[PDB]
C-alpha cells in the first residue's frame, strides 16, 4: 500500500482529536466510598 | 457527419492518386496532385448538388475538362469507397447488438438448456441480425415522420405568410477533463510531487540495463564523460533519477561513485541544494582528500554560497 | 500426456469463479513467445469462448516482463538450416490467435505489468479491456532488428491520432502507462502496490456485463493526467515533420530544422532513424498509410504477405543480418543489403507487398474463419 | 389486473390523511383552549380512520399449486392460581415438488385456529432446495440439530424413498424421488424438521464446487 | 502597515509556507472538482448541498 | 496524481482516526497503530464510499425508496437537508426525527396509533417498504440494523473500529470512517449530488 | 432463514428457484457489488519513524516547546518537533556526529527562538 | 512423523477456521512437504514455501479459504490397488469430494493416481 504510507512523511497527521483527547484528561487508586460520593451528590449537583 | 465525409474525402485521396499515378504514368506528382485537387474540387461539387445517393444511383455524363474513363474510374472508386463505409458500419452495429441483453438472456436459456458450440453462435448471429433488422425498420419509419414534419411545417408557413489532424482531448473512466484547469491541476500537483521528494525513479529496461552494468565495472582514472552523456540521453534523469543512479553506484563502484558527483557538480537537473555540498565536502573530510575538498569549496564559492 | 510437462509449466493457467487467466511463464527468454505457446493459448481461449460456464478470461505475465516478442533466433536457426515451414507455421497461429484476439466473444482483460514489446501488445492490444502499470513500457524496435510491425500492430498503429502511429513505428519509441492511456490503447491505469486488489476484485465478480466489469475497474483504478514532458504534447511537431510522403522528405526536412535551428528533438530523431535497416522503413510507411483504411483481417493479410516475402529472402537478407547482429554477435553495428536508402525503388517495395496468392500457391495466403466468425473489429 | 389498482386506491387515500393529519398536527401547538380540544377530536378521527384503512392491507396470500401438510398438534398447559390454562400448538409444512419448501409455528387456544394461524404463517418462510437430475441429492449428508442427527444417502433412479414419517413428507414436499435416510438420536418432531433444513441446505451441489474451486466438475460417465 | 506586514511575517520564514504535501493550499483544486473526482462522474449544473459555513 | 489530492481530502476531514483496540473483522481495513489509536485505510475509505454512493445513485433507475436514519444530534441538518433532496415532496419531518425510537417500526409497520397528548409527536409507519436504509448510528441506539437484516433489506453505513461482529455481519455497504462533522457533509455531498445526477438524466 | 450465503448471493438464489419475487434492490446490487479486500493475517503493524528516538528527548531538549493543534492549525504544518528531527535525520544523513548533530540543530532552534523573541519586541514596537 | 503431521494440519484447519492469510509450520518433513504438494495440486492451498530444509525446517504456507479438514492416520494402514475406491467410499465424509493420499513405491500418490498406476501401500491420510 503507498498512499497513506506516503503521507505519513509529512506534517504532523497523526493528531489526537478533541473528543479522545477530552477523555484522556477526563481519565487523568479505587475509588471514594459509596457513603462518601453519596453525600457530595446530595448536597452538591441538585443544580 | 463531419466524421463521415472527412472519411470518404481521405479514402478518396489515397485511392485516386494511386489511380492516377497508373492511369498517366507520365504524368509527375504535381501534375498529379493538380489532377487531385480538380477531382476532389468536382466531387465535393457532384455531392453538394445531389448528395452520396446520387453517388450510388447511375452514371452521369462527364466534363469536357476529363475524359469518360476518367469519370468511370471515379464512379467505380466513389462506388468502392461506399460499400467500404456501409460495411464498416454495419459491423460496428452487430458488434454492439450481439451483446444487446435481450439476445443475451436467450443465448443464457440455450445454454442452460444444452445448445453449445456453434449452433450457439449461429443462433446468438441470427438473433443480432433480427435485433438489428428491426432497428433498420424504427429508423426509417422515424427518418420518413421527419421529414414529412418538416415538409408540412414549411409548406404551412409558406401559406400563412404572404489531410493534417492532431489533437488532445483527455477522458479517463468516461470523464472529460479537457479544460485547461486540468492541465494548470496536473501541472501544479506534479510540481509539488516533485518538490517534497514524493517522486519515483522511472525503471531501468532495455538498453540501460548494460549502461549501468558498464557504470559498475568502470575503472579508476577513466572519464565518465561519454557514458554520462550517453544515459542523460537515455533515461532523461531529473533530481529523483540522478540520485538513484549515484545510490545504486554507491554499491557498484566507490571510485566511480566519487568520478560522478564531481562531474555532475552545476548541473540544473540534480538541483543541487547545501546538502549536498556538505555530505561531499564531510565524505571527503573521511576519505583525506584536502585538496579536493579545495575544490568542492570552489565550486560551490562560485555560485555565490559562503 | 507426458510429453508437454515443459508447455504446461510455460502456460500456467489459473482458476477463478467464473473467470480463467493464462500466465506466461518464460523466465529464460522473458516471456517470448514459441509455437508451442501460441498453440497452447490457442486451445486454451477456443475452450474458454465455448464453455458457457466462464464469463470473461485475462491474461497476465509473470516477472518484470510481461512479454518481450516472439523467438526469433530460433527461427534464424530454422532459415540456417535451410527449411522455412517452421517459420511460416509460426506466423499463421501468431496471427490466427491475434485474430482471434480480435473477434473474442467474451470479455478480455490483458495486465501489463512491465515491458511490451513486438507481438507481446499485439496479443493484448486488441482485447477489450487493457490495464497498465506504473512499470509499463510499450515499444515498437522492429525496424532495427529489419522486420514489420506485424501481429496486427499495424492496426492499432494506425488508429492512433495524427501521424504519431508512424512517429512511433519509425523511431522505436517508448511509451508509459500515463501515454498509453492518453493514446486510448490502455483502458485503465493502476499502480503496481494496488495489483492485489484490482486482481482479486476481479477475481470474484459473477458478472458478464461490459459496464459492471468497466465500472469496478475504474472504482478500483487510479486517476492520472500527463506531465509536461508526455509525448502528445509534441503532436503539432509530430503532424509537421512526420507528415509527407516519402521517408527522404522527412529525413531531410529534419536533417534542415536541426541544422538551421538546432533543435534537440530532431537530433534524437535522427539518431533514432539512422540506426534502422533502410529497406524496412517504406515497407512500415506503406503499412501504416495502407492500414489507416483496412480492417483488421486485412492487416493481418498483408502483415502475413510481407513476413513470409521477407524470410524468404526475396530481395534482401536483412532480417537474418538484424538478428544475428543484434542477438548472437551482438558487436551493435549490422550491414544492410542496401547500405543506403535512396537506391531502394517501388519495384523492391512492391515485392513485399506482392499479392503472391496469385503465383497458384494458396499456402502463401493466411487463412481465416471469417465466415465462422463473422469477424466485426 | 385489479389487484394493483385496488392497493394503489388505499395508498393514495393514505397519503391523503398523511397530509391532513400534519396540517392538524402543525397547529395543535400555537393552538389552545377549545379549539384545540376540538382539533384534539378531529385528529382522533382522522386516527381510527387511517388504522381502518391500514388494517385492510393485511391481506394474507397463499400460493396456488403448493401442498400444505400438518407435521404435529401439541396441547400446552400453563397453571394458574384458578386452574390450567390450556393451549395449542400447531407446526405445518409447504411446499411445490419443484424445490420450494417452507414450514411455520403458532399457537392458539382451539386445534383448528392453530393450523389455520400456521396456515397464514406457513408462506413466509420459503427455503430453496438444490436436486440432482431432479430426483435426488447429490452427495450423502450427515447434519446434526441439538440431539437430533439426520443422515441422507443418494441412490439410483429405481429405488424409492426409505424415511419416517416427518422426514418422509418434508422430501416429498421438497420434491426428491430417490433418497435413503436414517434419524438417529433424539426423534423430537421440530428438531427433526429443523434438521432436515440444515442438512438440505449443507449439500455441495457440483456446480458450487465448479465455482468454489475453479476447475471444471463432469459428470463420470460423460467421460 | 507596509513596515507592519514584512515584521509580521518573521514570525513565519524558515519556511514560510510548510506543508510538504498540502495540495489544495500549493494548488487551486475546487470542492466541486473534488467531488467530481469522487463517484467518478460529471457535475455541471448540479446543486448539491449548502456549504457548511451555511 | 489526482488520487493522491483525493486522498488528502479524506485525510483533511479527519476519518482516518479510529478508535483504539479494533476488532477482529476491522483489521482488513485498518493501517496501523500509533498515539493510541487505529489508522484506518484511506484507499479503501474511499473505495467503500464510491461502491455506496455507485449503488444508490443506481437505485433511481429503478425508483426505489431510500429511508434515512439518524440518531447523532451533531447531524440533524446535513441529514435533513439530504433527505428533504432526496425523498422529495414525500418527507414528514415527525417521522424522520421519531419513528426510529420506536422498537419494531419496520417488521411491525402496520399496527394501529392512538393519540395521547403533545406527547413527542404521533407518527405513523411509512407506507411503502423501504428498499435502503441509510444508517448514522454509532451508539446503537435503535434497532434498524437488526430490523433490516430480519427484512431483507440494504444497509448502508459507517462503522467503528469497534462495531460488534453481530451488528457488523448485517451490513451491507460498510464505509470505515470516523464520522466527523466533515466526513458526514461529504458523505451526504456525494450521496446527494449522485442521487440528483441520475434524476437529471430522466429529464426530471 | 437457514439459506447460506450474504444478502446478493441468498436473494439471487432464491429469485432464481421462483421462491420469492425480485425486489427493486436486486439489479442496483448488481450493478454496484460490495467491495472486497484480501485476507490481512489479523496482524496490525505499529507504525513508527526514523525520527522518533529524536523526537523523544525533543520534550525534555528544549524542554517543552511548542504546540501547534490546540493551536489548531492543520494536519500539515509540522510541530517543531517535527521540523527538529526532519533537520537531525538530513543532518546526520551527512555523517556528523550524533551529539554535534544535536548541539548544532540545538543552538539553531535558540538563535530561532531569539528571532520570534526579537520579532515580538518590534511587535511592540510598532504598537 | 504422524503426530507432527496431524499437528501441522490441525495447525492449518484451526488458522483457516479464522480467516487468516499465512501459516507457519515447525517442525516439518519431506512427508508433510509432498502432502502439501498433493494439496496444492488439487487447489485447497495456493502456495507454500520450505526454508533451510536440511538443519532446521519452518514452512510458510498461504490460504484461501477452500479447505474444511485435513486429516492424518494416527495408526498403520495397509492398502491395495484394487481397495482404494472402496476404501474411499467409507473414508470421505461425503463419498465425493476429497482425496485420500497414500504413500507407495512409486512416491506419495493420491487416491486417485494410484488407481491409475496399480500401486498400493501405507494410507497417511484425507482432506477435503
Ligand atoms: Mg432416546
Given at each position: 500500500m503507498h498512499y497513506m504510507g506516503l503521507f505519513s512523511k509529512a506534517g504532523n497527521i497523526f493528531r489526537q482529536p478533541r473528543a479522545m483527547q477530552a477523555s484522556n484528561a477526563m481519565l487523568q487508586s479505587k475509588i471514594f466510598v459509596g457513603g462518601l460520593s453519596p453525600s457530595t451528590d446530595v448536597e452538591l449537583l441538585k443544580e | 457527419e463531419d466524421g463521415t465525409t472527412n472519411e470518404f474525402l481521405s479514402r478518396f485521396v489515397w485511392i485516386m492518386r494511386g489511380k492516377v499515378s497508373e492511369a498517366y504514368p507520365d504524368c509527375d506528382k504535381k501534375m498529379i496532385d493538380g489532377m487531385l485537387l480538380l477531382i476532389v474540387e468536382k466531387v465535393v461539387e457532384e455531392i453538394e448538388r445531389g448528395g452520396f445517393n446520387k453517388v450510388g444511383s447511375a452514371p452521369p455524363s462527364p466534363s469536357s475538362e476529363f475524359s469518360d474513363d476518367l469519370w468511370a474510374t471515379i464512379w467505380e472508386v466513389s462506388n468502392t469507397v461506399l460499400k467500404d463505409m456501409e460495411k464498416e458500419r454495419k459491423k460496428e452495429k452487430m458488434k454492439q447488438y450481439v451483446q444487446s441483453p435481450e439476445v443475451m438472456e436467450m443465448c443464457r436459456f440455450a445454454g442452460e438448456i444444452g445448445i453449445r458450440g456453434d449452433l450457439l453462435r449461429e443462433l446468438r448471429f441470427k438473433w443480432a441480425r433480427e435485433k438489428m433488422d428491426d432497428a433498420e425498420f424504427y429508423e426509417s419509419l422515424e427518418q420518413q415522420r421527419d421529414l414529412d414534419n418538416s415538409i408540412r411545417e414549411s409548406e404551412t408557413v409558406d401559406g400563412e405568410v404572404e489531410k493534417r489532424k492532431g489533437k488532445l482531448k483527455y477522458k479517463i473512466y468516461g470523464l472529460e477533463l479537457s479544460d485547461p484547469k486540468w492541465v494548470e491541476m496536473a501541472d501544479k500537483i506534479h510540481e509539488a510531487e516533485e518538490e517534497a521528494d514524493w517522486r519515483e525513479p522511472k525503471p531501468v529496461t532495455g538498453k540501460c540495463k548494460l549502461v549501468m552494468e558498464k557504470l559498475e565495472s568502470l575503472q579508476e582514472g577513466d572519464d565518465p564523460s561519454?557514458?554520462?552523456?550517453?544515459?542523460?540521453?537515455?533515461?532523461?534523469?531529473?533530481?529523483?533519477?540522478?540520485?538513484?543512479?549515484?545510490?545504486?553506484?554507491?554499491?557498484?563502484?566507490?571510485?566511480?561513485?566519487?568520478?560522478?558527483?564531481?562531474?555532475?557538480?552545476?548541473?540544473?537537473?540534480?538541483?543541487?541544494?547545501?546538502?549536498?555540498?556538505?555530505?561531499?565536502?564531510h565524505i571527503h573530510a573521511k576519505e583525506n582528500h584536502i585538496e579536493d575538498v579545495e575544490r568542492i569549496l570552489k565550486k560551490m564559492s562560485q555560485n555565490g554560497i559562503f | 500426456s507426458a510429453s508437454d510437462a515443459d508447455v504446461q509449466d510455460q502456460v500456467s493457467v489459473e482458476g477463478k469463479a467464473k473467470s480463467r487467466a493464462a500466465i506466461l511463464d518464460r523466465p529464460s527468454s522473458l516471456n517470448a513467445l514459441s509455437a508451442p505457446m501460441v498453440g497452447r493459448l490457442k486451445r486454451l481461449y477456443e475452450?474458454?469462448?465455448?464453455?458457457?460456464?466462464?464469463?470473461?478470461?485475462?491474461?497476465?505475465?509473470?516477472?518484470?516482463?510481461?512479454?518481450?516478442?516472439?523467438?526469433?533466433?530460433?527461427?534464424?536457426?530454422?532459415?540456417?538450416?535451410?527449411?522455412?515451414?517452421?517459420?511460416?507455421?509460426?506466423?499463421?497461429?501468431?496471427?490466427?490467435?491475434?485474430?482471434?484476439?480480435?473477434?473474442?466473444?467474451?470479455?478480455?482483460?490483458?495486465?501489463?505489468?512491465?515491458?511490451?514489446?513486438?507481438?507481446?501488445?499485439?496479443?493484448?492490444?486488441?482485447?477489450?479491456?487493457?490495464?497498465?502499470?506504473?512499470?509499463?513500457?510499450?515499444?515498437?524496435?522492429?525496424?532495427?532488428?529489419?522486420?514489420?510491425?506485424?501481429?496486427?500492430?499495424?492496426?492499432?498503429?494506425?488508429?492512433?491520432?495524427?501521424?504519431?502511429?508512424?512517429?512511433?513505428?519509425?523511431?522505436?519509441?517508448?511509451?508509459?502507462?500515463?501515454?498509453?492511456?492518453?493514446?486510448?490503447?490502455?483502458?485503465?491505469?493502476?499502480?503496481?502496490?494496488?495489483?492485489?486488489?484490482?486482481?482479486?476484485?476481479?477475481?470474484?465478480?459473477?458478472?458478464?456485463?461490459?459496464?459492471?466489469?468497466?465500472?469496478?475497474?475504474?472504482?478500483?483504478?487510479?486517476?492520472?493526467?500527463?506531465?509536461?514532458?508526455?509525448?502528445?504534447?509534441?503532436?503539432?511537431?509530430?503532424?509537421?515533420?512526420?507528415?509527407?510522403?516519402?521517408?527522404?522528405?522527412?529525413?531531410?526536412?529534419?536533417?534542415?530544422?536541426?541544422?538551421?535551428?538546432?533543435?534537440?528533438?530532431?537530433?534524437?530523431?535522427?539518431?533514432?532513424?539512422?540506426?534502422?535497416?533502410?529497406?524496412?522503413?517504406?515497407?512500415?510507411?506503406?503499412?501504416?498509410?495502407?492500414?489507416?483504411?483496412?480492417?483488421?483481417?486485412q492487416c493481418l493479410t498483408r502483415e502475413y504477405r510481407i513476413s513470409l516475402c521477407g524470410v524468404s529472402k526475396t530481395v534482401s537478407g536483412d532480417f537474418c543480418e538484424g538478428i544475428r547482429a543484434r542477438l548472437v554477435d551482438k558487436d551493435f553495428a549490422p550491414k544492410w543489403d542496401p547500405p543506403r536508402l535512396e537506391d531502394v525503388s517501388k519495384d523492391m517495395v512492391d515485392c513485399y507487398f506482392s499479392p503472391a496468392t496469385d503465383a497458384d500457391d494458396s499456402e502463401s495466403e493466411l487463412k481465416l474463419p471469417t465466415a465462422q466468425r463473422e469477424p466485426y473489429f | 389486473?385489479?389487484?394493483?389498482?385496488?392497493?394503489?386506491?388505499?395508498?393514495?387515500?393514505?397519503?391523503?390523511?398523511?397530509?391532513?393529519?400534519?396540517?392538524?398536527?402543525?397547529?395543535?401547538?400555537?393552538?389552545?383552549?377549545?379549539?384545540?380540544?376540538?382539533?384534539?377530536?378531529?385528529?382522533?378521527?382522522?386516527?381510527?380512520?387511517?388504522?381502518?384503512?391500514?388494517?385492510?392491507?393485511?391481506?394474507?396470500?397463499?400460493?396456488?399449486?403448493?401442498?400444505?401438510?400438518?407435521?404435529?398438534?401439541?396441547?400446552?398447559?400453563?397453571?394458574?392460581?384458578?386452574?390450567?390454562?390450556?393451549?395449542?400448538?400447531?407446526?405445518?409444512?409447504?411446499?411445490?415438488?419443484?424445490?420450494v419448501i417452507g414450514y411455520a409455528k403458532a399457537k392458539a387456544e382451539t386445534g383448528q385456529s392453530a393450523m389455520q394461524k400456521a396456515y397464514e404463517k406457513c408462506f413466509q418462510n420459503l427455503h430453496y432446495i438444490e436436486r440432482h437430475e431432479e430426483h435426488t441429492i447429490a452427495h450423502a449428508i450427515q447434519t446434526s440439530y441439538k440431539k437430533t442427527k439426520l443422515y441422507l444417502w443418494p441412490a439410483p433412479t429405481t429405488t424409492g424413498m426409505k424415511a419416517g414419517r416427518v422426514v418422509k413428507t418434508m422430501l416429498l414436499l421438497a420434491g426428491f424421488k430417490n433418497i435413503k435416510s436414517k434419524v438417529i438420536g433424539s426423534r423430537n418432531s421440530y428438531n427433526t424438521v429443523k434438521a432436515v433444513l440444515k442438512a438440505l441446505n449443507a449439500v455441495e451441489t457440483p456446480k458450487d464446487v465448479q465455482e468454489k474451486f475453479g476447475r471444471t466438475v463432469v459428470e463420470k460417465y460423460l467421460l | 502597515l507596509f513596515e507592519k506586514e514584512e515584521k509580521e511575517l518573521t514570525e513565519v520564514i524558515k519556511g514560510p509556507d510548510r506543508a510538504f504535501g498540502d495540495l489544495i493550499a500549493k494548488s487551486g483544486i475546487t470542492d466541486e472538482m473534488l467531488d467530481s473526482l469522487i463517484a467518478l462522474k460529471d457535475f455541471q449544473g448540479v446543486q448539491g448541498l449548502p456549504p457548511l459555513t451555511e | 496524481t489526482l488520487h493522491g489530492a483525493v486522498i488528502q481530502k479524506l485525510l483533511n476531514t479527519g476519518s482516518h482516526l479510529g478508535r483504539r483496540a479494533a476488532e477482529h473483522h476491522f483489521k482488513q481495513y485498518a493501517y496501523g497503530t500509533r498515539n493510541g489509536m487505529t489508522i484506518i485505510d484511506s484507499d479503501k475509505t474511499l473505495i467503500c464510499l464510491r461502491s455506496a454512493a455507485s449503488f444508490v445513485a443506481n437505485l433511481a433507475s429503478a425508483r426505489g425508496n431510500i429511508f434515512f436514519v439518524n440518531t447523532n444530534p451533531l447531524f440533524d441538518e446535513i441529514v435533513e437537508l439530504t433527505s428533504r433532496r432526496i425523498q422529495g415532496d414525500a418527507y414528514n419531518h415527525n417521522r424522520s426525527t421519531n419513528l426510529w425510537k420506536m422498537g419494531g417500526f419496520l417488521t411491525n409497520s402496520y399496527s394501529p396509533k392512538k393519540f395521547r397528548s403533545r406527547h413527542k409527536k404521533l407518527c405513523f409507519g411509512p407506507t411503502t417498504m423501504p428498499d435502503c436504509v441509510v444508517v448514522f448510528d454509532a451508539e446503537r441506539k435503535s434497532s434498524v440494523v437488526l430490523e433490516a437484516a430480519k427484512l431483507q433489506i440494504p444497509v448502508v453505513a459507517i462503522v467503528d473500529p469497534n462495531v460488534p461482529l453481530e451488528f457488523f455481519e448485517k451490513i451491507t455497504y460498510p464505509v470505515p470512517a470516523r464520522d466527523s462533522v466533515k466526513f458526514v457533509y461529504l458523505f451526504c455531498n456525494v450521496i446527494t449530488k449522485c442521487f440528483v445526477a441520475e434524476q437529471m438524466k430522466m429529464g426530471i | 432463514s437457514w439459506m447460506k450465503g450474504d444478502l446478493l448471493?441468498?436473494?439471487?438464489?432464491?429469485?432464481?428457484?421462483?421462491?420469492?419475487?425480485?425486489?427493486?434492490?436486486?439489479?442496483?446490487?448488481?450493478?454496484?457489488?460490495?467491495?472486497?479486500?484480501?485476507?490481512?493475517?489479523?496482524?496490525?503493524?505499529?507504525?513508527?519513524?526514523?525520527?522518533?528516538?529524536?523526537?523523544?528527548?525533543?520534550?525534555?531538549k528544549h524542554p517543552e516547546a511548542k504546540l501547534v493543534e490546540p493551536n489548531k492549525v492543520s494536519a500539515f504544518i509540522p510541530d517543531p518537533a517535527r521540523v527538529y528531527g526532519c533537520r537531525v535525520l538530513e543532518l546526520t544523513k551527512n555523517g556528523?556526529?550524533?551529539?554535534?548533530?544535536?548541539?548544532?540543530?540545538?543552538?539553531?532552534?535558540?538563535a530561532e527562538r531569539k528571532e520570534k523573541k526579537k520579532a515580538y519586541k518590534r511587535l511592540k514596537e510598532l504598537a | 512423523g504422524r503426530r507432527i503431521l496431524n499437528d501441522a494440519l490441525r495447525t492449518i484447519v484451526n488458522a483457516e477456521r479464522r480467516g487468516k492469510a499465512s501459516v507457519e509450520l515447525k517442525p516439518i518433513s519431506t512427508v508433510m512437504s509432498s502432502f502439501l504438494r498433493i494439496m496444492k495440486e488439487k487447489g485447497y492451498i495456493k502456495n507454500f514455501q520450505v526454508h533451510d530444509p536440511h538443519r532446521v525446517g519452518r514452512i510458510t504456507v498461504d490460504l484461501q479459504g477452500r479447505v474444511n479438514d485435513c486429516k492424518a492416520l494416527t495408526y498403520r494402514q495397509d492398502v491395495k490397488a484394487k481397495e482404494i475406491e472402496e476404501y474411499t467410499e467409507r473414508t470421505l465424509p461425503t463419498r465425493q469430494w476429497g482425496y485420500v493420499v497414500v504413500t507407495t513405491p512409486d512416491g506419495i500418490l493420491d487416491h486417485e493416481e494410484a488407481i491409475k498406476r496399480n500401486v498400493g501401500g501405507q494410507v497417511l491420510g484425507f482432506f477435503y
Open positions: - | 561519454g557514458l554520462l552523456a550517453e544515459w542523460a540521453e537515455l533515461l532523461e534523469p531529473n533530481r529523483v533519477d540522478w540520485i538513484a543512479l549515484i545510490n545504486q553506484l554507491r554499491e557498484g563502484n566507490t571510485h566511480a561513485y566519487l568520478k560522478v558527483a564531481e562531474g555532475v557538480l552545476d548541473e540544473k537537473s540534480f538541483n543541487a541544494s547545501i546538502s549536498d555540498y556538505s555530505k561531499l565536502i | 475452450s474458454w469462448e465455448e464453455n458457457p460456464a466462464i464469463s470473461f478470461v485475462l491474461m497476465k505475465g509473470s516477472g518484470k516482463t510481461f512479454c518481450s516478442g516472439a523467438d526469433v533466433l530460433p527461427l534464424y536457426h530454422s532459415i540456417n538450416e535451410g527449411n522455412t515451414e517452421e517459420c511460416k507455421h509460426f506466423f499463421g497461429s501468431l496471427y490466427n490467435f491475434v485474430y482471434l484476439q480480435g473477434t473474442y466473444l467474451k470479455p478480455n482483460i490483458a495486465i501489463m505489468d512491465g515491458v511490451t514489446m513486438g507481438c507481446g501488445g499485439g496479443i493484448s492490444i486488441p482485447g477489450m479491456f487493457r490495464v497498465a502499470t506504473d512499470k509499463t513500457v510499450l515499444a515498437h524496435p522492429e525496424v532495427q532488428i529489419g522486420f514489420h510491425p506485424d501481429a496486427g500492430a499495424s492496426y492499432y498503429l494506425s488508429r492512433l491520432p495524427g501521424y504519431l502511429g508512424e512517429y512511433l513505428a519509425l523511431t522505436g519509441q517508448k511509451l508509459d502507462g500515463v501515454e498509453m492511456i492518453a493514446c486510448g490503447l490502455a483502458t485503465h491505469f493502476c499502480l503496481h502496490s494496488r495489483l492485489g486488489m484490482v486482481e482479486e476484485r476481479i477475481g470474484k465478480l459473477l458478472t458478464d456485463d461490459p459496464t459492471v466489469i468497466e465500472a469496478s475497474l475504474a472504482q478500483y483504478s487510479d486517476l492520472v493526467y500527463p506531465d509536461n514532458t508526455s509525448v502528445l504534447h509534441k503532436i503539432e511537431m509530430i503532424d509537421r515533420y512526420f507528415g509527407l510522403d516519402t521517408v527522404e522528405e522527412i529525413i531531410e526536412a529534419m536533417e534542415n530544422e536541426v541544422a538551421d535551428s538546432g533543435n534537440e528533438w530532431c537530433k534524437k530523431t535522427l539518431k533514432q532513424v539512422k540506426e534502422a535497416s533502410p529497406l524496412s522503413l517504406k515497407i512500415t510507411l506503406q503499412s501504416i498509410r495502407e492500414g489507416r483504411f483496412q480492417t483488421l483481417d | 389486473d385489479d389487484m394493483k389498482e385496488r392497493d394503489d386506491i388505499l395508498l393514495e387515500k393514505l397519503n391523503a390523511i398523511d397530509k391532513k393529519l400534519e396540517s392538524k398536527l402543525s397547529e395543535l401547538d400555537h393552538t389552545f383552549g377549545k379549539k384545540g380540544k376540538r382539533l384534539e377530536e378531529e385528529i382522533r378521527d382522522l386516527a381510527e380512520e387511517r388504522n381502518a384503512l391500514t388494517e385492510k392491507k393485511r391481506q394474507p396470500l397463499y400460493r396456488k399449486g403448493y401442498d400444505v401438510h400438518v407435521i404435529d398438534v401439541k396441547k400446552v398447559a400453563k397453571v394458574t392460581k384458578g386452574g390450567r390454562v390450556e393451549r395449542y400448538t400447531a407446526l405445518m409444512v409447504c411446499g411445490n415438488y419443484e424445490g | - | - | 448471493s441468498k436473494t439471487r438464489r432464491l429469485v432464481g428457484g421462483l421462491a420469492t419475487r425480485e425486489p427493486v434492490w436486486l439489479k442496483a446490487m448488481e450493478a454496484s457489488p460490495p467491495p472486497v479486500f484480501p485476507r490481512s493475517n489479523g496482524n496490525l503493524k505499529k507504525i513508527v519513524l526514523p525520527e522518533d528516538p529524536y523526537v523523544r528527548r525533543f520534550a525534555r556528523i556526529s550524533e551529539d554535534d548533530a544535536m548541539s548544532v540543530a540545538n543552538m539553531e532552534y535558540l | -
